[PDB]
Design an enzyme around this catalytic site. Structure first.
Site, short mmCIF file in Angstrom:
data_model
loop_
_atom_site.label_atom_id
_atom_site.label_comp_id
_atom_site.label_asym_id
_atom_site.label_seq_id
_atom_site.Cartn_x
_atom_site.Cartn_y
_atom_site.Cartn_z
N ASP C 25 -68.45 20.14 53.83
CA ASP C 25 -67.66 19.04 53.65
C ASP C 25 -68.72 18.40 52.65
O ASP C 25 -69.64 17.64 53.05
CB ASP C 25 -67.61 18.51 54.33
CG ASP C 25 -66.68 17.41 54.40
OD1 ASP C 25 -66.16 16.52 53.87
OD2 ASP C 25 -65.52 17.56 55.58
N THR C 26 -67.91 18.08 51.56
CA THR C 26 -68.89 16.54 50.52
C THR C 26 -68.55 15.68 51.52
O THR C 26 -69.61 14.63 50.87
CB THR C 26 -68.19 16.98 49.18
OG1 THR C 26 -66.53 16.90 48.83
CG2 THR C 26 -68.58 18.65 48.70
N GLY C 27 -67.49 14.86 51.95
CA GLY C 27 -67.35 14.28 51.80
C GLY C 27 -68.15 13.61 53.77
O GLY C 27 -67.95 12.74 54.65
#
Lengths: 99, 4, 99, 4
Positions: C25-27
């Protein structure tokens, strides 16, 4: 070009002319924005996240201008703590997660 | 992360 | 190599020998896993997500084996709906978001 | 997405 992930991958997008700063999230299936109004032609939705879930208004074929492109796609509005573009818009933008 |  | 974002970017990782399927997950700033026990040397934490927040146990210098590498890093455990590796581990893995 |  690329984002390295030491800082959050935030960009400015224009959703129907409105400027909004969005976090590009590979773990979001959907994109949900707040503080923009897109009108009454929506279907209601509930999306879950880490702490529980929220009520959203799903809009179809909204126009989004971001990173040099204009694409039309699905935006939801709801009380998100941060605005996110999920994989529905990132696939439209040809983004991949490389290593 | 978010989904339904 | 790369993940294209039409399907969720899920891989199997081993956290101290335990196999776990994780969403990259980049967020997420942090990585939080469930259904693994890492012991009593933790600091308690609360992390927020879309619908609210959760209680987590933050562990430091845990060993993680994933995508051909062994790295040691910070894992939290808490009642997450899906296990996520956030940017703290993705930067350790040399991942970038390319377009 | 998650943070504190």
């Amino acid at each position: 070009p690329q984002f390295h992930l030491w800082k959050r991958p935030v960009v400015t997008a224009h959703i129907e002319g409105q400027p909004v700063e969005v976090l590009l999230d590979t773990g979001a299936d959907d994109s949900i924005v707040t503080g923009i109004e897109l009108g009454p032609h929506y279907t209601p939705k509930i999306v879950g996240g880490i702490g529980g879930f929220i009520n959203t208004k799903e809009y179809k074929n909204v126009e989004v201008e971001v990173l040099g492109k204009r694409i039309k796609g699905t935006i939801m509005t709801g009380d998100t703590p941060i605005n996110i573009f999920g994989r529905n818009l990132l696939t439209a933008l040809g983004m991949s997660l490389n290593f | 992360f978010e989904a339904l």
